[PDB]
Symmetry: none
Subunit: 164 residues, 6 copies
């Protein structure tokens, strides 16, 4: 299906204005960490140790340690800043959490992103991009900003520490 | 005049996507060093000696030695990384330089920042923040991360060289 | 500082005969739009949509939509005519531009205006009026021609676009 | 006889400092409207209707409607501004009027212009220009500023509305 | 802000050894004429007539005729000698000009002066003196050499030409 | 022996900070007048008449009149300014004088300059320059700034008035 460009992300992010607060935060976390929505929903505060967010991908078993100093230039996302916002605004045991501080599921996150997407009025060639497409956007952005190698390493394609 | 928060800095930073390459770098350098724009524009590579960026403030005459190991945690800004980028991307005699490696003036930096600010679409209570507001942001962020004493020290509110005395910034 | 009257504006305008082509046009645009020089220098052709010149004041953040049908009767200044001249004679990305189609800075505009002012040979009580005085002139002329409310509106003292709200100027 | 250049007009205008107030106003009106002195003296406020000054030339019968929005760049003359000054300063039934608010004749206007001309100290090759030469100056100035066609149309050489 | 003494002027002058050729000349012209930097940058060769440099101050409108025979004894500055050097070394339409004979702006002059000031290594009580401090120095030196009346006259605190009246400076 | 460059003069001048006040003043006077130390020590206030310092060189008999308006650009030395400082700070019958206002000898001046030189930490190829080398520095500086002819005229190599 259709991909998601940076400009399109900005339009959806804007429409997410009237969405629950965690949606915009989940979008930021998805692009800056490049992790699958299933893993994003599993992330907990105890997973962060000494400036590194440890992630064992549920689907692949790939274990990586993501530096919280990461940032995506094109969208102006600072991983630390996003994490600070998740801590203060959401305040759950899970980094990403509902308004009632409960863990979120992939279906719920994807569903709300879809609503924000419709609210933006964007048109796409073929099936509109889902929340999952934020992972490809992350790779494409990190490739230009750093390197295709870095993008691949971060996505889990190769605890394996992520550096740069 | 309105202040600029860390989240607002990031919106403007994003909006700077279509600005000259030096804008984002000047923004980062302003927040991590806390120096006035006039002084940012004066900084040269020869001012860095043994991991320290020597700055004599143009307006006040205050002489400080800034450790290049500094980081602004809230925004993920590393002074060393930023300087590396300035060297690799701008490559002028001055740390901040145009695409043609020429020095920049305070007016030009402020002007481009103002344009990126408008592009972000942010709304402000009162007059919008200018590039100068990045110095106040630096202070508030450093006050939290390190201390009110550190911030006042960095802002300019003793490695004695060949005559002149410099205030060494620590931690 | 001294004010500038309509008759004095014309003496300086005459004196601008030997000034760059953009000076007279910048003078006309300053009086008919009432915008600060910093904003005049920022205006671009892309800011004009369906007979309206959109302006976000750099200093205040005030967003207004100026109808291009405006006229300053006292001096025979037509905004549309002036814009046509700017397009045909200057032809830059910015409405006001140099002979090389480059953007102009507030300092340059003020400097050339100051020179034309001296060339006119006018005498003033107190410090002579600067290019900024054209904004006050705009207000006084509009206050008489239309209303004190209109002038304050134009000076910056609701076409809602993609997010941002604009104050539409009427009559 | 000799012509009158823009710089020469400025010198005479300067010397007109000590001349009756209507002289400078008549000079401005002469250059911006390009009309003969005989017609200038006949102009009345009732001749202006909806931003147009209607003039039927006495000598030729040519009927033209001059837009009050006209202006001469070289000399910084705004027709509306000059008319506003004539209204406030002179205040007669005729646009151009004496100090005692009475109509002026061509001879009087020409005579005072001649005195201002002498007072300026200018030297000319051949007979000095008279007030009549302001009409040629008008044409030469409007030609450069707009076009020879416009100059001719305004002078009455071709109610005929004047536009541009 | 700190004042600048005659001895300090010489230290900065020495330090200007590696500055553009126009810096030392602009410094000399500032002290011997006592004019604001904005006006120094505006001066042209056509302004000198029969041994007098005609200056209409941009800010105040004050019109003075400065005799080119002036000297600043305390520093050995001769106005005629300085002007000769400006003509021979700079050779622009403006008395003070860049290496490419282009006019200079107040900001550029101040900026280079500030750099020479730092290079001298002088220490100051309070904010260091800027190029503007050369005008106060001119006044204090002239007050001693000639009189308080002369200084106030020169600073701008009657050869009547074609309309405009000029204040002739004497002795 | 080794020569003295302008940069070296600046370093020694800086080290002269802790030297008697007359040393720095003697250094300035030596470079701006280009006279031998023996003559510098003989200079008196009565030798200055109408902006000219009259000097009859002891060794050669050469009589020259040095304009007090002279200045050395490279070192920022104004002869008048230096003389003003000698008058106010030293206040002796001799232009150059000791702390107790007594005349100085060549040996004393040379000796203190040597101490300031050592204090600067400079290294030289061959024998370090003595106070006498300030005379050569003067010539080399005046040559570039004005002309070799001027340098020679000032040094006494050709009352003979010095001009320019």
């Amino acid at each position: 299906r259709s991909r998601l460009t940076a400009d399109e992300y900005l339009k959806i992010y804007q429409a997410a204005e009237s969405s629950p607060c965690w949606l915009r935060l989940a979008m930021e976390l998805a692009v800056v960490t490049g992790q699958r929505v299933g893993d994003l929903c599993e992330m907990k505060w105890s997973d962060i140790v000494d400036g590194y967010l440890y992630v064992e991908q549920s689907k692949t078993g790939v274990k990586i340690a993501i530096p919280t100093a990461l940032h995506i230039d094109a969208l102006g996302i600072s991983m630390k800043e996003t994490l600070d916002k998740c801590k203060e605004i959401l305040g759950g045991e899970t980094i990403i959490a509902s308004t009632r501080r409960e863990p979120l599921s992939s279906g719920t996150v994807s569903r709300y992103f879809m609503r924000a997407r419709k609210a933006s009025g964007l048109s796409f060639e073929g099936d509109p991009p889902t929340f999952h497409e934020l992972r490809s956007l992350s790779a494409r952005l990190y490739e230009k900003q750093i390197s295709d190698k870095f993008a691949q390493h971060l996505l889990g394609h190769k605890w394996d520490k992520i550096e740069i």
